[PDB]
Design an enzyme around this catalytic site. Structure first.
Site, PDB file in Angstrom:
ATOM      1  N   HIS A 118       0.865  -1.184   0.000  1.00 21.89           N
ATOM      2  CA  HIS A 118       0.000   0.000   0.000  1.00 21.89           C
ATOM      3  C   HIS A 118       0.904   1.237   0.000  1.00 21.89           C
ATOM      4  O   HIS A 118       2.131   1.124  -0.033  1.00 21.89           O
ATOM      5  CB  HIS A 118      -1.042  -0.007   1.140  1.00 21.89           C
ATOM      6  CG  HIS A 118      -0.495   0.094   2.535  1.00 21.89           C
ATOM      7  ND1 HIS A 118       0.006  -0.992   3.227  1.00 21.89           N
ATOM      8  CD2 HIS A 118      -0.486   1.131   3.411  1.00 21.89           C
ATOM      9  CE1 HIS A 118       0.365  -0.610   4.442  1.00 21.89           C
ATOM     10  NE2 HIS A 118       0.063   0.669   4.587  1.00 21.89           N
ATOM     11  N   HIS A 141      -7.014  -1.492   6.422  1.00 23.33           N
ATOM     12  CA  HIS A 141      -6.074  -0.490   6.925  1.00 23.33           C
ATOM     13  C   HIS A 141      -5.974   0.702   5.981  1.00 23.33           C
ATOM     14  O   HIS A 141      -5.872   1.858   6.422  1.00 23.33           O
ATOM     15  CB  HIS A 141      -4.723  -1.169   7.114  1.00 23.33           C
ATOM     16  CG  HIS A 141      -3.574  -0.240   7.368  1.00 23.33           C
ATOM     17  ND1 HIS A 141      -3.269   0.232   8.626  1.00 23.33           N
ATOM     18  CD2 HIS A 141      -2.602   0.227   6.545  1.00 23.33           C
ATOM     19  CE1 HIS A 141      -2.185   0.986   8.559  1.00 23.33           C
ATOM     20  NE2 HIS A 141      -1.753   0.994   7.307  1.00 23.33           N
ATOM     21  N   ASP A 167       6.028   3.318   5.043  1.00 27.24           N
ATOM     22  CA  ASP A 167       6.707   2.097   5.484  1.00 27.24           C
ATOM     23  C   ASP A 167       6.661   0.998   4.430  1.00 27.24           C
ATOM     24  O   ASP A 167       7.373  -0.006   4.565  1.00 27.24           O
ATOM     25  CB  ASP A 167       6.137   1.595   6.822  1.00 27.24           C
ATOM     26  CG  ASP A 167       4.656   1.258   6.763  1.00 27.24           C
ATOM     27  OD1 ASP A 167       3.877   2.072   6.240  1.00 27.24           O
ATOM     28  OD2 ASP A 167       4.272   0.187   7.278  1.00 27.24           O
ATOM     29  N   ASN A 175      -3.509   3.186  13.723  1.00 28.38           N
ATOM     30  CA  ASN A 175      -3.732   4.263  12.773  1.00 28.38           C
ATOM     31  C   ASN A 175      -4.914   3.915  11.880  1.00 28.38           C
ATOM     32  O   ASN A 175      -4.825   2.996  11.061  1.00 28.38           O
ATOM     33  CB  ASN A 175      -2.466   4.453  11.950  1.00 28.38           C
ATOM     34  CG  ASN A 175      -2.650   5.430  10.817  1.00 28.38           C
ATOM     35  OD1 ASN A 175      -3.606   6.202  10.793  1.00 28.38           O
ATOM     36  ND2 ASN A 175      -1.725   5.403   9.873  1.00 28.38           N
ATOM     37  N   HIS A 229       1.627   3.756   2.040  1.00 29.56           N
ATOM     38  CA  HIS A 229       2.267   4.397   3.171  1.00 29.56           C
ATOM     39  C   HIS A 229       3.786   4.287   3.071  1.00 29.56           C
ATOM     40  O   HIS A 229       4.332   3.374   2.456  1.00 29.56           O
ATOM     41  CB  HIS A 229       1.792   3.783   4.476  1.00 29.56           C
ATOM     42  CG  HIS A 229       0.418   4.204   4.876  1.00 29.56           C
ATOM     43  ND1 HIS A 229      -0.338   3.491   5.780  1.00 29.56           N
ATOM     44  CD2 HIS A 229      -0.324   5.281   4.527  1.00 29.56           C
ATOM     45  CE1 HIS A 229      -1.498   4.103   5.956  1.00 29.56           C
ATOM     46  NE2 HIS A 229      -1.512   5.193   5.212  1.00 29.56           N
TER      47      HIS A 229
HETATM   48  O1  6TJ Z   1      -1.356   0.267  11.727  1.00 35.66           O
HETATM   49  C1  6TJ Z   1      -0.761   0.881  12.649  1.00 35.66           C
HETATM   50  O2  6TJ Z   1      -1.409   1.517  13.517  1.00 35.66           O
HETATM   51  C2  6TJ Z   1       0.755   0.912  12.769  1.00 35.66           C
HETATM   52  C3  6TJ Z   1       1.371   0.164  13.762  1.00 35.66           C
HETATM   53  C4  6TJ Z   1       2.760   0.194  13.901  1.00 35.66           C
HETATM   54  C5  6TJ Z   1       3.521   0.975  13.042  1.00 35.66           C
HETATM   55  C6  6TJ Z   1       2.902   1.733  12.048  1.00 35.66           C
HETATM   56  C7  6TJ Z   1       1.527   1.705  11.907  1.00 35.66           C
HETATM   57  C8  6TJ Z   1       1.142   2.626  10.749  1.00 35.66           C
HETATM   58  O3  6TJ Z   1       0.033   2.824  10.371  1.00 35.66           O
HETATM   59  N1  6TJ Z   1       2.371   3.170  10.204  1.00 35.66           N
HETATM   60  C9  6TJ Z   1       2.502   4.128   9.134  1.00 35.66           C
HETATM   61  C10 6TJ Z   1       3.761   4.532   8.712  1.00 35.66           C
HETATM   62  C11 6TJ Z   1       3.875   5.495   7.718  1.00 35.66           C
HETATM   63  C12 6TJ Z   1       2.734   6.056   7.176  1.00 35.66           C
HETATM   64  C13 6TJ Z   1       1.482   5.674   7.627  1.00 35.66           C
HETATM   65  C14 6TJ Z   1       1.369   4.714   8.615  1.00 35.66           C
HETATM   66  C15 6TJ Z   1       3.473   2.677  10.981  1.00 35.66           C
HETATM   67 ZN    ZN Z   2       0.043   1.609   6.434  1.00 35.79          ZN
HETATM   68 ZN    ZN Z   3       2.474  -0.337   8.033  1.00 38.59          ZN
END
Ligand code: 6TJ
Ligand code: ZN
Ligand code: ZN
Ligand code: MG
Length: 222
Positions: A76, A141, A80, A172, A78
């Protein structure tokens, strides 16, 4: 935790997971991806969360595996998942993602995989890409999130649509579709009932229970 750690471990013959650490919302988190042997080459699933980590991953692969990464898929938009795509492309890796992922990454100012994967636009769609199956379960997600299955090893890579067992509350949800997320997990469960090893985007892998656990957490949020 420490930031910028990058390592990998073997799940099965020709299947590894890579683990990197980086900062999100001012805290250090781990992040998972996949490596699958593809003849005399490697297929990479997701970056190691940034250019610096991803260059470190390419060197770690030479230390531990010694086969060239030739293609990469981001699951996806994001950072990461795509941060590090520019490093990959300069290293001679062909980078791929769905058209939705490419579009959403561009809007964000994130790095953009070069090639568009058609055939994944409708929930339940699946395509084979080298030694893996790519599956779009529907929005979860994020609206574009893909999951990856290794048919030869019964390994299911849930990506960030799937949570680790220790998580008790949703994380998130800024880009998530909470109304669809349980249905999307249901499609994964129905499509990959023989999965023996399940990998979340962040945190510890486990068995198929990670799927039902994620539904539990998402519904309890709603
Ligand atoms: O899904 C999550 O909440 C989550 C948990 C651990 C680490 C991360 C997440 C998440 O949503 N990330 C992320 C990183 C960069 C951009 C958007 C989201 C990093
Ligand atoms: Zn993500
Ligand atoms: Zn992630
Ligand atoms: Mg916010």
């Amino acid at each position: 935790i420490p930031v910028g750690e990058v390592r990998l471990y073997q799940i099965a013959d020709g299947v590894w997971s890579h683990i990197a650490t980086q900062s999100f919302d001012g805290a250090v988190y781990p992040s998972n991806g996949l490596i699958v042997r593809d003849g005399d080459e490697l297929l990479l699933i997701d970056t190691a969360w940034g250019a610096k980590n991803t260059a470190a991953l390419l060197a770690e692969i030479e230390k531990q595996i010694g086969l060239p990464v030739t293609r990469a898929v981001s699951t996806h938009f994001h950072d990461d998942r795509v941060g590090g795509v520019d490093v990959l492309r300069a290293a001679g890796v062909a980078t791929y993602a769905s058209p939705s992922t490419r579009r959403l990454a561009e809007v964000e100012g994130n790095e953009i995989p070069t090639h568009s994967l058609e055939g994944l636009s409708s929930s339940g769609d699946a395509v084979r890409f080298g030694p893996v199956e790519l599956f779009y379960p529907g929005a979860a997600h994020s609206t574009d999130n893909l999951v990856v299955y290794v048919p030869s090893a019964s390994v299911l890579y849930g990506g960030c649509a799937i949570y680790e067992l220790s998580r008790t509350s949703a994380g998130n949800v800024a880009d998530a579709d909470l109304a669809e997320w349980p249905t999307s997990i249901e499609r994964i469960q129905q499509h990959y009932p023989e999965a023996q090893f399940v990998i979340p985007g962040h945190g510890l892998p486990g068995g198929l229970d990670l799927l039902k656990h994620t539904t539990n957490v998402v519904k309890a949020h709603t």
